[PDB]
Design a protein around this ligand. Structure first.
Ligand SMILES: CCCCCCCCCCCCCCCCCC(=O)OC[C@H](CO[C@@H]1O[C@H](CO[C@H]2O[C@H](CO)[C@H](O)[C@H](O)[C@H]2O)[C@H](O)[C@H](O)[C@H]1O)OC(=O)CCCCCCCCCCCCCCCCC
Ligand code: CLA
Ligand code: CLA
Ligand code: CLA
Ligand code: CLA
Ligand code: CLA
Ligand SMILES: CCCCCCCCCCCCCCCC(=O)OC[C@H](COP(=O)(O)OC[C@@H](O)CO)OC(=O)CCCCCCCCCCCCCCC
Ligand SMILES: CCCCCCCCCCCCCCCC(=O)OC[C@H](COP(=O)(O)OC[C@@H](O)CO)OC(=O)CCCCCCCCCCCCCCC
Ligand SMILES: CC1=C(/C=C/C(C)=C/C=C/C(C)=C/C=C/C=C(C)/C=C/C=C(C)/C=C/C2=C(C)CCCC2(C)C)C(C)(C)CCC1
Ligand SMILES: CC1=C(/C=C/C(C)=C/C=C/C(C)=C/C=C/C=C(C)/C=C/C=C(C)/C=C/C2=C(C)CCCC2(C)C)C(C)(C)CCC1
Ligand SMILES: CC1=C(/C=C/C(C)=C/C=C/C(C)=C/C=C/C=C(C)/C=C/C=C(C)/C=C/C2=C(C)CCCC2(C)C)C(C)(C)CCC1
Ligand code: OEX
Ligand SMILES: [Ca+2]
Ligand SMILES: [Ca+2]
Ligand SMILES: [Cl-]
Ligand SMILES: [Cl-]
Ligand SMILES: [Fe+2]
Ligand SMILES: [Mg+2]
Lengths: 34, 65, 40, 341, 504, 81, 29, 32, 37, 30, 39, 167
């Protein structure tokens, strides 16, 4: 099928960039002193 | 806090934090300018909208040549 | 002609006004089948 | 002391109908918008703008009455009563569709008034202004659909007309011409609305079914006191129920209620963005890969290509009557039709 | 700690680091501009301003450089199609370079202000607390904005000291950068009058200087300072966002309807020019004048510039695109190569027939030909069994005048139909669809993309305004309402005036 | 409470119904006559059942010119013989 | 027509009449 | 003659409503 | 250097990570078809 | 690749459901 | 010259000023008569 | 496929003009409105338990006995927004209404589809308005009808051999 050849990297970065932002924030919250 | 040559020069411009004129001050004059600005916007809008049509004002690509 | 409240029971007011609504709306429904808008 | 403070006092008095400074904008504009609609749907035609009967007077019913948009030839004229089109003639103004701009513009300023009222009342009573913030969604919708959309199109003609059936026509137009159902911004809108209705239902039901017994009555409404300090229902029992039924549950009441704001408000905002695109015909109409395949391969068929055939039907069959200013004449032989039908 | 959506609030009472953050934002935006210009220069083909101008090539920043007088490349070409021109430093490349350097300098400045956040300048001389005198800052900045606005109008746009601006004829055929004199009469408020843009900047600039001086010199009324919370920097954010969404809506509007600042040679034609057949009318006017001066039909149509004909084609209408149809217009219908000429359709009786044009609303459209009076004479039938108007029954032929096909006539129904299908789009062109693997599906121009982005951003910025206005005016209650809130203030009949405790 | 007399007190009072047994029927009848005298048509410019078309025409009187719209409608109205 | 509307009002009044009558003579409502 | 905001509010709605309902009632008897 | 008193710790709890990941993934699932076109 | 992409996202969503349910922060009565 | 539409504009502007002027005159008048009790 | 179903349904049942679908819309628009309203009103009246540098959500602890917002403040706001008596002061009554409105509306939606299943369809005002001569005067209903016809004639373009689509 003749798909847009940037669709793959667009979808990958769309998922990964904000997911990584959240993972960074979560993990550094856990590592904070209790 | 750190003083610098430029900071010393600019000092007076950031020295009157919170200073006000008493009561309503120039508010009435401000309101006049606001009203005038509102009418101005209404005029340019109605011109663009062709609601206000003026002699020698052809609101079209064929405005000049 | 007193401004005295409660002189005419609220249940009578509600029933009469209610029947008034039914009548007006009934007339509008009749009009759907007669004259303009009836398709006829 | 001082007329402004004296006026402020009176405007903000605790009366049956709160007025406020906001009321000076709100009440006239809202009244004129509503009164404009009732007046037009009762008495006013759309014969000269649309070739349509649109009032009770002409024989329309509640479902078919409308205040219709002006003719396409008016462009985006403000169509002011005293403007160069109607020239102060009230009758001609009505016949030209002037009540449409009347209702749209007064309605817009009325909405501004209502949101200002939400702010004004919140400030006076001392609550946070989240209700006003939430109201930004209805405002985004109204502005995008009734103002931005026709402003990007040829004229007000293509804005929604104010009527039940007229709005239905607007929906179907958006399907046939914009393929609006395919638009992910509309899809998010759908999610927010249906998700909001879901949250409304599920929360209402949950509270009503985790109530503490606070009276002896079988009708349980009496057993609540507005001033009571205690929760009227069990958050702990509610949480266990949903955790075991669905897998997850709210545990935080503040999050719960914020989420109820968030979902439908965000949904409406997303749908507004899509309509802004549609103002420009910037549609989600097609998938290019689908079309390239289908064009080359006459056995390839999906629900996506099936819907475009329906759209093509809609455009050809509705356009001549729906867009009378175009003077379309489509001979019978050019109309797309399947077998028999 | 701070929730993710509040991380930047650490700047609220830290003027030095706010400046640093602002410097970083400015570095990023200027870097974007430089990057964008370089990418466009790496992709832009300058070899045909007639049928392959910037707006066919998905150029977004190139038109903004062109609008204010940057028209040449160091490599020797001009957007007007000249060769051997020397643009000096301020070519497209020089502008791109300048923005990249600016970005770097701003970045370095941001680092300095971040590290040296604790400047005495930011402290209140009395309390020693961080403090910004916002009313005076407004005057200073307004004055500066005034001087720049004035200077821009008086020197740059006039050509007194600067290049002027892009101007053209009413049909966008002969565009160039020219000095423009201010228009001081009422036609200065005509959006399509470039002289109005110049007068605006001179006049509004002077008003900015005056009002800035006022705002430097005169303190706010206590009543306004209190009402608008002028000690709170978030008040400025709220009203600035309002000003910005107003401006964004305005530029979306002038881009869509057209103005002297959104020329069609830089951004493409408007949808309304197709709606009203603006170019078709001018083409027909020029042809008639040629015929009246004794030209043959061939000569009359051959005298129509390809550039004018190309405007009269729906593939250049910005209202024919798709949200996910990405890239240059060339990626759709192809890179336009040549005008085929004007197609004249005739039936077997010799009557001229006219193809009904596609309105922007329609993704697809039937093929219907009428006589001069709008009576249907021919069409392409869907169902064939009761066809009355087929090209085959009606002996439809097509003859071309001007362009590549000048003087040719086609009579075979497949070919006549093919050209009729193209005529629904207006004037007919030859396209290169191979170079970019064009898919044959219409895309919008930068006029369309600009309008979309700015109308969307403007709408979203309305939420920003409401949000920050609320935060400003309700600062006291934003962590929640008074725990010991008197029930009398919320219940009715306790106070005569709502909120007022002294009306009990 | 807000300081005004409750609605339930008002609409159950003799004074209320004495006033409104006059004013309600009067407004209702005035509305009826606004339509039955045909004045509604004239105020709003709504076609009567015999005023949509001239006898033979089947074409809608669609407004096609923004600034001569007033005249166009007037022309359409004259063409109704 | 008028006969229909008259039967309506008579049958329609009857219910409220039973209630009104009992309310007047302090009945077991 | 002492009015209230509420009184004004009620009547700006109720007065036209009744008038309109009479109008619409009359329309039910219009024949083409 | 003398420390900046305006600094604050930042937090994202587990529930917010899960909500956020859900948002991103569902948005990707929705928008991906349009990215591929 | 498109299909891989769609299925990947879906698969991640299902994995997220598992963690959100079975590895949630437990609700605690104070 | 004063075009029909400029005359139209002036009519619109005056009308708006009258509506607003009367609204505020009436609201000020009422507020002056009907004052809140406080000392 | 859902959109397909919906468009064909409109062509074959004029569902938009059916009062049960109309009740459905009031149910879901209303549900979303009341969702937003309730959410905003409770959020507006949260009792201050936190500082500015933390989320207000930490001001509520799971299982706490006391209410987390001031319902009197909430009611005092909403009562003034409209008028005192349009506002719920009884939280049980409020939450019942939140349950009932969308649930009842959606029951009607479901009954719309379930009765249109037996071809009792939306209102049909096609050519309902006629002039003195007998000319059809179109209404918005007639325009809807043209759109419906477009859907009807195109759907399942190879499936029908006879003139009427009877199922
Ligand atoms: C959220 C905030 C909440 C607040 C909401 C409440 C606000 C209510 C008040 C706002 C009302 C504004 C109405 C603007 C009417 C308009 O625009 O009317 C349109 C006119 C332009 O007129 C149009 O112009 C078109 C193009 O014409 C031009 O081109 C033609 C073809 O070549 C001819 O040459 C012609 O002579 C030439 O003028 C056609 O002629 C149309 O028929 C004609 O209507 O512009 C104009 O008045 C002014 C244009 C510039 C300013 C626009 C800013 C406001 C709108 C922003 C949204 C833009 C929409 C873009 C789509 C996305
Ligand atoms: C002789 C002196 C002079 C001259 C010739 C001009 C000439 C011009 N001015 Mg300038 N001006 C001047 C002095 C002058 N000015 C002075 C002294 C000031 C005070 C500082 C200004 C402040 C000013 C402003 C604020 C604006 C102009 C604008 C303009 C342009 C009007 C044409 C246009 O395209 O409007 C198009 C714009 C409009 C018709 C205004 C629209 C008003 C909207 C409808 C208000 C509501 C918006 C709100 C956000 C809601 C929108 C809802 C929507 C989403 C549906 C033109 C270049 C306008 C411009 O920049 O255009 C590009 C403009 O907005 N001027
Ligand atoms: C004002 C912004 C703006 C505008 C109007 C344009 C306009 C244009 N650009 Mg430029 N560009 C921009 C900024 C912009 N650009 C930026 C910031 C970058 C860096 C990434 C670029 C880099 C760039 C490149 C590399 C290229 C262009 C090209 C183009 C052209 C084609 C555009 C296109 O296909 O869009 C497609 C637009 C869409 C598909 C819309 C995207 C919608 C998003 C995904 C929605 C997101 C929804 C969101 C996630 C929902 C959240 C919900 C939540 C809140 C609950 C056009 C002239 C092309 C060209 O032809 O150049 C010569 C080209 O190759 N641009
Ligand atoms: C000049 C414009 C401007 C500025 C300077 C601010 C600044 C601020 N905002 Mg406001 N806001 C704005 C416009 C602006 N906003 C607009 C247009 C909207 C509607 C979209 C909002 C809606 C809004 C809300 C609802 C909130 C704020 C909040 C805040 C504060 C904290 C921000 C933060 O930490 O985010 C941190 C953000 C991230 C870590 C990631 C954000 C990622 C986004 C969603 C996607 C990526 C965007 C991309 C990188 C940027 C390109 C932008 C360009 C196209 C314009 C800060 C004072 C918060 C607050 O009040 O704190 C008390 C808050 O709750 N803003
Ligand atoms: C839904 C609309 C809406 C709402 C609820 C608010 C609410 C708020 N505004 Mg914003 N604002 C808006 C839209 C809105 N605004 C628009 C469209 C603009 C123009 C860009 C602004 C510009 C603005 C500024 C600069 C400021 C605010 C501020 C405020 C806050 C205080 C109240 C105020 O000043 O009201 C403003 C009053 C109104 C919105 C009512 C306007 C009524 C106009 C005058 C009627 C005009 C009729 C017109 C002439 C008829 C002709 C129509 C024509 C088409 C023919 C509050 C958060 C202040 C703030 O944030 O303080 C912290 C602040 O400084 N507003
Ligand atoms: C706040 C209430 C309010 C608001 C915001 C509006 C708003 C509007 N009306 Mg509605 N109207 C209202 C109440 C209101 N109306 C009432 C109560 C009635 C019944 C009488 C009407 C009856 C009505 C009709 C019949 C129509 C409108 C129309 C309009 C629109 C255009 C108005 C216009 O162009 O005014 C222009 C005038 C102004 C904006 C007033 C400006 C006054 C300035 C501030 C004075 C300047 C003084 C200056 C400061 C002095 C400086 C001195 C210096 C020289 C030294 C606009 C949407 C038109 C419309 O809807 O068409 C589709 C229309 O036809 N209105
Ligand atoms: C008697 C009404 C007929 C039922 C219609 C359905 C509405 C009620 C059920 C909604 C389900 C919500 C999910 C559970 C939500 C839930 O748990 O509710 C709980 C709520 C309170 O429970 P209680 O135990 O206090 O009372 C119920 C019994 O125990 C009797 O005391 O139940 C009711 O209020 C029933 C009220 C019936 C009285 C009338 C209801 C109003 C609807 C009338 C229909 C008019 C609309 C037609 C016009 C289009
Ligand atoms: C028979 C068992 C059936 C189990 C089926 C599996 C159900 C999966 C439920 C969703 C789990 C994921 C939740 C992550 C997020 C998560 O863990 O949330 C946990 C969160 C807990 O809320 P709390 O009140 O405890 O936390 C609030 C504070 O911590 C915030 O700081 O729950 C909610 O926020 C409820 C509202 C979100 C409701 C989202 C429902 C989504 C439905 C599914 C939509 C995606 C469809 C994609 C299909 C391709
Ligand atoms: C109160 C109310 C209301 C209203 C209501 C109404 C309006 C009603 C009604 C009603 C009615 C109005 C009724 C009734 C009734 C009646 C009846 C129940 C009867 C009966 C009868 C009979 C049974 C009979 C019989 C017969 C026969 C069979 C044959 C021949 C003879 C005779 C006639 C004897 C409302 C909602 C507003 C609200 C709340 C409350
Ligand atoms: C436009 C205009 C104006 C104004 C006006 C007005 C303000 C009006 C009004 C009005 C109105 C204000 C009206 C009314 C009305 C109404 C009605 C017509 C009604 C009705 C109803 C009904 C029929 C009912 C029913 C129902 C329902 C709803 C539901 C449940 C049940 C029932 C069935 C009961 C002016 C002069 C400024 C100027 C120019 C234009
Ligand atoms: C350091 C330095 C330097 C350098 C510099 C540089 C080299 C730079 C740069 C820069 C740059 C090169 C940059 C840039 C940038 C960029 C940007 C900032 C961007 C962005 C973006 C965005 C934001 C986006 C977004 C979006 C998307 C993605 C998709 C669609 C939608 C939207 C549009 C939303 C020098 C040697 C001179 C000197 C000294 C120092
Ligand atoms: O399969 Mn599904 O859509 Ca119920 O209608 Mn008959 O079938 Mn067919 O056509 Mn129409
Ligand atoms: Ca190829
Ligand atoms: Ca007759
Ligand atoms: Cl189908
Ligand atoms: Cl069959
Ligand atoms: Fe709740
Ligand atoms: Mg009738």
């Amino acid at each position: 099928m003749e798909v847009n050849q940037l669709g793959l990297i667009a979808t990958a970065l769309f998922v990964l960039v904000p997911s990584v932002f959240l993972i960074i924030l979560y993990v550094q919250t856990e590592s904070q002193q209790k | 806090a750190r003083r610098t040559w430029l900071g010393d020069i600019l000092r007076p411009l950031n020295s009157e934090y919170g200073k006000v004129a008493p009561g309503w001050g120039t508010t009435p004059l401000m309101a006049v300018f606001m009203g005038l600005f509102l009418v101005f916007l209404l005029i340019i809008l109605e011109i663009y909208n062709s609601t206000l049509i003026l002699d020698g004002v052809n609101v079209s690509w064929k405005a000049l040549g | 002609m007193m401004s005295e409240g409660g002189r005419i029971p609220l249940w009578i007011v509600a029933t009469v006004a209610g029947m008034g609504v039914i009548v007006i709306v009934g007339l509008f429904f009749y009009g759907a089948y007669a004259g303009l808008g009836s398709s006829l | 002391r001082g007329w402004f403070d004296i006026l402020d006092d009176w405007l903000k008095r605790d009366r049956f109908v709160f007025v406020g400074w906001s009321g000076i904008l709100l009440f006239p504009c809202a009244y004129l918008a509503l009164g404009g609609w009732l007046t037009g749907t009762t008495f006013v035609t759309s014969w000269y703008t649309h070739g349509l009967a649109s009032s009770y007077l002409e024989g329309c019913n509640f479902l078919t009455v409308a205040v219709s948009t002006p003719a396409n030839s008016m462009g985006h004229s403000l169509l002011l009563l005293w403007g160069p089109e109607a020239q102060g003639d009230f009758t001609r103004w009505c016949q030209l569709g002037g009540l449409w701009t009347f209702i749209a513009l007064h309605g817009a300023f009325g909405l501004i008034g209502f949101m200002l009222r939400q702010f004004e009342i919140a400030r006076l009573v001392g609550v946070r202004p989240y209700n006003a913030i939430a109201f930004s969604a209805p405002i985004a919708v109204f502005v995008s659909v009734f103002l931005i959309y026709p402003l990007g199109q040829s004229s007000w003609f293509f804005a929604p007309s104010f009527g039940v059936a007229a709005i239905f026509r607007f929906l179907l137009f958006f399907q046939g011409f914009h393929n609006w159902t395919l638009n992910p911004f509309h899809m998010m809108g759908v999610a927010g609305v249906l998700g909001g209705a879901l949250l409304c239902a599920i929360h209402g039901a949950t509270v009503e079914n985790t109530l503490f017994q606070d009276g002896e009555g079988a009708s349980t409404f009496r057993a609540f006191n507005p001033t009571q300090a205690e929760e009227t229902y069990s958050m702990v029992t509610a949480n266990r129920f949903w955790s075991q039924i669905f897998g997850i549950a709210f545990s935080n009441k503040r999050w719960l209620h914020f989420f109820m704001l968030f979902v439908p408000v965000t949904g409406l905002w997303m749908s507004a963005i899509g309509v802004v695109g549609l103002a420009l015909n910037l549609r989600s109409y097609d998938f290019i890969s689908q079309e390239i395949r289908a064009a080359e391969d006459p056995e390839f068929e999906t629900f996506y290509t099936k819907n475009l055939l329906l759209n093509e039907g809609i455009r050809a069959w509705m356009a001549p009557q729906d867009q009378p200013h175009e003077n379309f004449v489509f001979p019978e032989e050019v109309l797309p039709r399947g077998n028999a039908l | 700690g701070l929730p993710w959506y509040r991380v930047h609030t650490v700047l609220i009472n830290d003027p030095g680091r706010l400046i640093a953050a602002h410097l970083m934002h400015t570095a990023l935006v200027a870097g974007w501009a430089g990057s964008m210009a370089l990418y466009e220069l790496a992709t832009f083909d300058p070899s045909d301003p007639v049928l392959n101008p910037m707006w066919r090539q998905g150029m977004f920043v190139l038109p903004f450089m062109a609008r204010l007088g940057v028209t040449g490349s160091w490599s020797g070409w001009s957007i007007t199609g000249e060769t051997g021109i020397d643009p000096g430093f301020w070519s497209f490349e020089g502008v791109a370079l300048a923005h990249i350097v600016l970005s770097g300098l701003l970045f370095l400045a941001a680092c300095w202000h971040w590290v040296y956040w604790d400047l005495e300048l930011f402290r209140d001389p009395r309390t020693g607390e961080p403090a910004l005198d916002l009313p005076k800052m407004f005057g200073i900045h307004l004055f500066l904005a005034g001087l720049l606005c004035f200077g821009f109008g008086a020197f740059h746009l006039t050509g007194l000291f600067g290049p002027g601006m892009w101007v053209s004829d009413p049909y966008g055929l002969t565009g160039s950068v020219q000095p423009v004199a201010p228009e001081w009469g009422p036609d200065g408020f005509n959006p399509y009058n470039p002289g109005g843009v110049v007068a605006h900047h001179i006049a509004a600039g002077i008003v900015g200087i005056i009002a800035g001086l006022f705002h430097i010199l005169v303190r706010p009324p206590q009543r306004l300072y209190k009402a608008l919370r002028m000690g709170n920097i978030e008040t400025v954010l709220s009203s600035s966002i309002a000003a910005v969404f107003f401006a964004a809506f305005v530029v979306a509007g002038t881009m869509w309807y057209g103005s002297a600042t959104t020329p069609i040679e830089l951004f493409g034609p408007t949808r309304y020019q197709w709606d009203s057949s603006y170019f078709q009318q001018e083409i027909n006017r020029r042809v008639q004048a040629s015929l009246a001066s004794g030209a043959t039909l061939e000569e009359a149509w051959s005298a129509i510039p390809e550039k004018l004909a190309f405007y009269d084609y729906i593939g250049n209408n910005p209202a024919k695109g798709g949200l996910f149809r990405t890239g240059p217009m060339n990626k759709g219908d192809g890179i336009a190569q040549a005008w085929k000429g004007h197609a004249v359709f005739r039936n077997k009786e010799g009557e001229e027939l006219f193809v009904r044009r596609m309105p922007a609303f329609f993704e697809s459209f039937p093929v219907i030909l009428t006589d001069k009076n709008g009576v249907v004479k021919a069409d392409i039938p869907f169902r064939r069994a009761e066809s009355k108007y087929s090209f085959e029954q009606q002996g439809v032929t097509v003859s071309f005048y001007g362009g590549e096909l000048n003087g040719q006539t086609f009579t075979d129904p497949p070919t006549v139909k093919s050209y009729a299908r193209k005529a629904i789009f207006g004037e007919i062109f030859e396209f290169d669809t191979e170079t970019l693997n064009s898919d044959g599906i219409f895309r919008t121009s930068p006029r369309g993309w600009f309008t979309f982005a700015h109308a969307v951003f403007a709408l979203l910025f309305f939420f920003g305004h409401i949000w920050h206005g609320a935060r400003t005016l309700f600062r006291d209650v934003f962590s929640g309402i008074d725990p010991e809130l008197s029930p009398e203030q919320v219940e009715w009949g306790f106070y005569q005036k709502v909120g007022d405790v002294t009306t009990r | 409470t807000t300081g005004e007399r409750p609605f339930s007190d008002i609409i159950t009072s003799v004074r209320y119904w004495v006033i409104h047994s006059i004013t309600i029927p009067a407004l209702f009848i005035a509305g009826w006559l606004f339509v039955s005298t045909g004045l509604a048509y004239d105020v709003f410019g709504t076609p009567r059942p015999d005023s949509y078309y001239a006898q033979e025409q089947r074409s809608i009187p669609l407004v096609t010119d923004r600034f001569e719209a007033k005249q166009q409608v007037e022309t359409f109205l004259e063409q109704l013989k | 027509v008028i006969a229909q509307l008259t039967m309506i009002a008579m049958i329609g009044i009857a219910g409220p009449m039973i209630i009104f009558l009992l309310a007047v003579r302090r009945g077991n409502l | 003659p002492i009015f209230t905001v509420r009184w004004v509010a009620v009547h700006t709605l109720a007065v036209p409503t009744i008038f309109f309902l009479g109008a619409i009632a009359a329309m039910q008897f219009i024949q083409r | 250097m003398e420390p900046n008193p305006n600094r604050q710790p930042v937090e994202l709890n587990r529930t917010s990570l899960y909500l956020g990941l859900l948002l991103i993934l569902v948005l990707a699932l929705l928008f991906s078809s349009y990215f591929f076109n | 690749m498109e299909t891989i992409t769609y299925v990947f996202i879906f698969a991640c969503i299902i994995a997220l459901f598992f963690f959100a349910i079975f590895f949630r922060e437990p609700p605690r009565i104070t | 010259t004063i075009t029909p539409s400029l005359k139209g504009f002036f009519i619109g502007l005056l009308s708006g000023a009258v509506v607003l002027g009367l609204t505020f005159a009436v609201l000020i008048a009422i507020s002056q008569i009907d004052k809140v009790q406080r000392s | 496929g859902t959109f397909n179903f919906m468009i064909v349904f409109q062509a074959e049942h004029n569902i938009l003009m059916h009062p049960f679908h109309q009740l459905g819309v009031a149910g879901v628009f209303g549900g979303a409105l009341f969702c937003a309203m309730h959410g905003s009103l409770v959020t507006s009246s949260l009792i201050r338990e936190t500082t500015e540098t933390e989320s207000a959500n930490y001001g509520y602890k799971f299982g706490q006995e006391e209410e987390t917002y001031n319902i009197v403040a909430a009611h005092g706001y909403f009562g003034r927004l409209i008028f005192q008596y349009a506002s719920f002061n009884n939280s049980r009554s409020l939450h019942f209404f939140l349950a009932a409105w969308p649930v009842v509306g959606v029951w009607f939606a479901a009954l719309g589809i379930s009765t249109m299943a037996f071809n009792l369809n939306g209102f049909n005002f096609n050519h309902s308005v006629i002039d003195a001569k007998g000319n059809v005067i179109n209404t918005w209903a007639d325009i809807i009808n043209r759109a419906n016809l477009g859907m009807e004639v195109m759907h399942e373009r190879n499936a029908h051999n006879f003139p009427l689509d009877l199922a």
